[PDB]
Amino acid sequence: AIKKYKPITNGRRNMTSLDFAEITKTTPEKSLLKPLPKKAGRNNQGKLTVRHHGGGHKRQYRVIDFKRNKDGINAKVDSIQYDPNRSANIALVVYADGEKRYIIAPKGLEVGQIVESGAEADIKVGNALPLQNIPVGTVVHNIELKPGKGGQIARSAGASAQVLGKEGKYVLIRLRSGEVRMILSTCRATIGQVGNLQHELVNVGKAGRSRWKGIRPTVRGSVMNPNDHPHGGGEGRAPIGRPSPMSPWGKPTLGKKTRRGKKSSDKLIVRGRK
Amino acid sequence: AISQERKNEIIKEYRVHETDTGSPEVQIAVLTAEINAVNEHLRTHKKDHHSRRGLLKMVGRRRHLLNYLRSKDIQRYRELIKSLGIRR
Amino acid sequence: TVVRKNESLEDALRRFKRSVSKSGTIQEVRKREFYEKPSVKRKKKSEAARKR
Amino acid sequence: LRAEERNDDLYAGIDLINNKLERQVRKYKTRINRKSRDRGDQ
Amino acid sequence: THIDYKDTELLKRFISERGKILPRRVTGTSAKYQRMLTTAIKRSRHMALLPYVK
Amino acid sequence: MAVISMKQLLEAGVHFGHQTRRWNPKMKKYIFTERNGIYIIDLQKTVKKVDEAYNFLKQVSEDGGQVLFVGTKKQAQESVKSEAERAGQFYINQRWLGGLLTNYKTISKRIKR
Amino acid sequence: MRTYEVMYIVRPNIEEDAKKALVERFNGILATEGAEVLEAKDWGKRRLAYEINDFKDGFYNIVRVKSDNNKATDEFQRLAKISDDIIRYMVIRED
Amino acid sequence: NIENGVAHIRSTFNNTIVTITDEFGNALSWSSAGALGFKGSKKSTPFAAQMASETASKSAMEHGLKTVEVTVKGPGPGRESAIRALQSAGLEVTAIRDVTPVPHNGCRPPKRRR
RNA sequence: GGAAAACUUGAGUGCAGAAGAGGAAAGUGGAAUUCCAUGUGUAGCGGUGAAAUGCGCAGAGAUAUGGAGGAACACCAGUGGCGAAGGCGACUUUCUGGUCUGUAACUGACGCUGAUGUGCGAAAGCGUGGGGAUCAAACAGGAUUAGAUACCCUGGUAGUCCACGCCGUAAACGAUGAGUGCUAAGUGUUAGGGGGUUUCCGCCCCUUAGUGCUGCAGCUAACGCAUUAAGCACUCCGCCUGG
């Protein structure tokens, strides 16, 4: 699942990679690719609006369907493939209808396995079906938050959510966060847990593997001048000298809650994060 | 272990004369069937340690009969190594 | 779980007091009031058998 | 509460009398501090 | 003989008045009968011919 | 339910009979065997008889008839009086008077008394 | 060479040819890979002693198989858990 | 709803608790020993069951559920003294059951008490 | 002792019967615990030698249905069974090890012990991941006391559980190495084997090998041991020689 590197070098020393044994085909599918230029933290005005983004490795975008629309048509799986743009793997499913498309590969998903995305579907790993027809208690992912828009929730590698109960036109669900939310009952969610479970366990072990990801280095606030950061310069190293740690733009950053209240989904959150 | 129709089959080739089971080379051959049967079981079941000293004991009862068989006739010992594959 | 009728309540108790004493309820939950060590119940059962 | 020391130092001997006195009170109190006995009436 | 696990009527005189097992101290059977009984009383608990408790 | 169960029927001890050398040959159908001069009443077959004894005696009282209970054996004298009062029927404890079913135009002369 | 005796239980709330359709898939499964069923005796409705999948009755089955492979009856164990009708099942070797 | 119900008592080693309900349990009324001014450790008495039983039974009053067929669900001192005191209310106790949770050696019980 | 032969008891294989929580892997099942969702319902619940911390009016506990998940397997269960020891307790299937009984067909001393070596080895630990229900070191808080860091109570992390590698230690104890003989008896019980009988199966009778309790001879410093020696012998190995 994971290979450890022998310490032949200081930069290779504690670094821990991931062997790609779930991957069965190392080549993308040429009709579902799309150019993905990097907007390295910069918006339409041209200026940097989120920090620490820059030039990683060049990437293609694979169009995968988070909405699962083709009802009652079976879909064999060709292959489990690599995707740079997300933490999970992707799965090239091929319909008996003839059309090819990707879905995010669940945990136990093999080649030659059929997948049904409709309301009259059996409750098996990879099948997509509305939350009304999903029985209470099972774990589920790729959750639509609005009917038809596509799955949004529990979609990174190893994420899942269990169906807790059913209100009138809502179902209860418990998130990977720990948060209990009401999601509208006519919304898809595919049965099972999404794979690539050992993604969180890579020690990238090197200042340059972080740069290949597109992650530019983060200079601390306490080693700045007092026009760059509110933790700007004392004489020598200084403690942060304020009642609270503060962000680069003068907001208290440790503990203070920033969810914008008086919101529509405030009726729908039942339990907070755990 | 092995079935009796498997066990009665293997005592036909190495038999020296009819109704002479219990001969040394006719009870080494049925051990080598039982050796090869149980460490194939033990190959897919690596945690079964109580069955391992059953193997390691009948390894010892095969070795004590091979060492016995050389002491009275060497030319019979050379034939059994060639008939069924053992080292040494 | 025995129904007792056609009598008073002070005689249905006399059935029920011995329909519980001949059952593994009171002697069972008094045993599991606290976890005993997995080799001291083998002697506790041995004392409850050698005396008979 | 009795105790005796046969020393000649009348300041160091009372360091042992108070030792024997403090031991005997704890014998008295733990004799009567076994009131805490879980006895449930019928 | 050998106790079959379907023969309920001879097998339920050995069950208790709640569903427990009578010991051979109070029933009076032999040793090897009691443990050939108990592997048949517990296959009959599994296929609902006899309860676990009543 | 319908019959006496097998456990309490032989716990009363109805499988015992009288002694061998004291035997009636017509009772061969209702004897399972003899163990030590003592015979053994077929317990499975008397259950097939006591239910037939239960069937008609159910429907005798359905017509409103009167069933006479008699008992005179000294170890079973007062076991039939207490069961006739619970039944509301007529018992006999002492000896048969000698005509209380046949010459009862002189016995009812004394039940009038 | 090996004598098996399965026993499987179906739902009470099924009708006639739904019942006899399910028993005839399994006796083909319990004939697969050289299994050659002795006979398939069927008990009737029994008031089963407790409450599985909040049901009160069950239709029982007894099929005796003479195999040497254990390929037919574990195939039966694979599919009877999948189907939501056949509620419990138990193979047992008789020696 | 009139004259049909299930009476539940579970006297533990403290605080005999009683909840009377209908035959398809929906919690008609309940009372305890703590609801009668017994603050602590007087609740583990049969005399606490002498008042706690009928003060839920007689203060039910919503349907006239006057039969009980009580259910016992606890090892306690006031176990049989809560059904003896239920005929002080006089509600025709007709089926007494000792339905207590007895494990099939399932979980680990807590530590011994020194 | 060497060599050439011969033998059958020792040892081993056959043949025919058994008994078993002996292991390993995969399935299945029920009661209970905890948590969540819901119905109904109202003031406490919980806990103790007494209380309090804690929980509850954002509906607690209690009750009823349904769900999820982890851990164990009540009754049977016994100075019982099995294994070399550690140990092993739901049920089913597959794979597999050992012992015992009986018959005498067969091999013909093939045996025993075993330094160095090589493998198993409770718990607590450690590593890489899982999983986390109860329980619970450390830790937090409330009481007790003369005093606390103890006992008691509420809560709680590692751990407890699984997979793979380690660690290799226990009052690992029958404080008793293994093997084979021989030496009063009495008595339970186990798988049998027979049995005589049968019993409605009941039993009660003689029989290898296990497993206990009594008790001579003999032994011991004394307790005690005594056909399961700590008795009488022979072989080999480990080990001790004041604290």
Short mmCIF file of C-alpha atoms in Angstrom, two decimals, chain E residues 18-48:
data_model
loop_
_atom_site.label_atom_id
_atom_site.label_comp_id
_atom_site.label_asym_id
_atom_site.label_seq_id
_atom_site.Cartn_x
_atom_site.Cartn_y
_atom_site.Cartn_z
CA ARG E 18 -37.35 -20.69 30.05
CA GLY E 19 -35.01 -22.02 27.34
CA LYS E 20 -31.89 -22.93 29.36
CA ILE E 21 -30.22 -26.35 29.50
CA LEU E 22 -30.91 -28.77 32.31
CA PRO E 23 -27.64 -30.16 33.68
CA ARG E 24 -27.13 -33.91 33.70
CA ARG E 25 -27.12 -33.65 37.50
CA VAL E 26 -30.87 -32.99 37.48
CA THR E 27 -31.78 -34.87 34.28
CA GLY E 28 -29.69 -37.98 34.90
CA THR E 29 -28.17 -38.70 31.48
CA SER E 30 -24.65 -39.97 30.92
CA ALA E 31 -21.57 -37.93 30.03
CA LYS E 32 -21.24 -38.52 26.29
CA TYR E 33 -25.00 -38.33 25.84
CA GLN E 34 -25.10 -34.84 27.39
CA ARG E 35 -22.46 -33.36 25.09
CA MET E 36 -23.85 -35.11 22.03
CA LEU E 37 -27.12 -33.54 23.16
CA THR E 38 -25.66 -30.07 23.55
CA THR E 39 -24.31 -29.87 20.01
CA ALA E 40 -27.82 -30.73 18.80
CA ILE E 41 -29.72 -28.41 21.15
CA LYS E 42 -27.61 -25.49 19.88
CA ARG E 43 -28.04 -26.23 16.19
CA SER E 44 -31.77 -26.25 16.95
CA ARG E 45 -31.50 -22.87 18.67
CA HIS E 46 -29.94 -21.51 15.49
CA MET E 47 -32.75 -22.64 13.17
CA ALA E 48 -35.53 -21.47 15.51
#
